[PDB]
């Protein structure tokens, strides 16, 4: 599923991310844009051999199992394919565990480099929230 901006904002808000560990909804939307372009099916291999899955590009090095990331963890206790569903629940509930890790949203390289410090509220402009 390829989400619309406001559509994604609203799903994210429903699922409890607006100001989750203090990150305004717009931070989550901006991250999602730059990680996946709002596409639940996005997959990208990392150089270390893990892969990033889904709307928030959650990595098989620590968070999910994809059956080919040797010597890695599965801290959200899911198959990585669950992160690719049209329903973002698993992605969201796993993002919550990630962003609580102590490094906050810096876990998302694209957030840090492209969202952080920016006018992230722009990402929810015009949405009926
Ligand atoms: Au959720
Ligand atoms: Au959802
Ligand atoms: Na893993």
Ligand closest to Cα of 87 equals 2
Of the residues 7, 35, 48, 119, only one is catalytic, namely 35
Q: Specify the residue for token string 């890790």.
A: 101
In this structure, are residues 35 and 129 in contact, taking their beta carbons and an 8 Å threshold?
no
Residue 125 CA to ligand 3 center (angstroms) comes to: 36
Q: State how far the Cα of 5 lies from the Cα of 71, in Å rounded to an integer.
A: 36
Give whole-number Cα distances, 53 to 56, 68, 77, 120, in Å.
7, 13, 14, 23
Cβ of 37: how many Cβ atoms within 10 Å? 11
Please enumerate, by residue number, every residue annotated as part of a binding site for substrate: 101
Task: State the maximum Cα–Cα separation within the chain, in Å, rounded to a whole number.
Answer: 45
Q: From CA 113, how far away is CA 80, in angstroms rounded?
A: 25
User: For residue 6, what are its two tokens?
Assistant: 């406001």
Kindly report the CATH class assigned to 1-129: mainly alpha
Measured in angstroms, how far is the CA atom of residue 28 from the centroid of ligand 1? 13
């Amino acid at each position: 599923k390829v989400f619309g901006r406001c559509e994604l904002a609203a799903a994210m808000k429903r699922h409890g991310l607006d100001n989750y560990r203090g990150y305004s909804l717009g931070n989550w939307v901006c991250a999602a844009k730059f990680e996946s372009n709002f596409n639940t099916q996005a997959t990208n291999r990392n150089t270390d051999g893990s892969t990033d899955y889904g709307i928030l590009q959650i990595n098989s090095r620590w968070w999910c199992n994809d059956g080919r990331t040797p010597g890695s963890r599965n801290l959200c206790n899911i198959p990585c394919s669950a992160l690719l569903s049209s329903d973002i629940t698993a992605s969201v509930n796993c993002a919550k565990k990630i962003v609580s890790d102590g490094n906050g949203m810096n876990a998302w390289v694209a957030w840090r480099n492209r969202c952080k410090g920016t006018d992230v509220q722009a990402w929810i402009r015009g949405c009926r929230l």
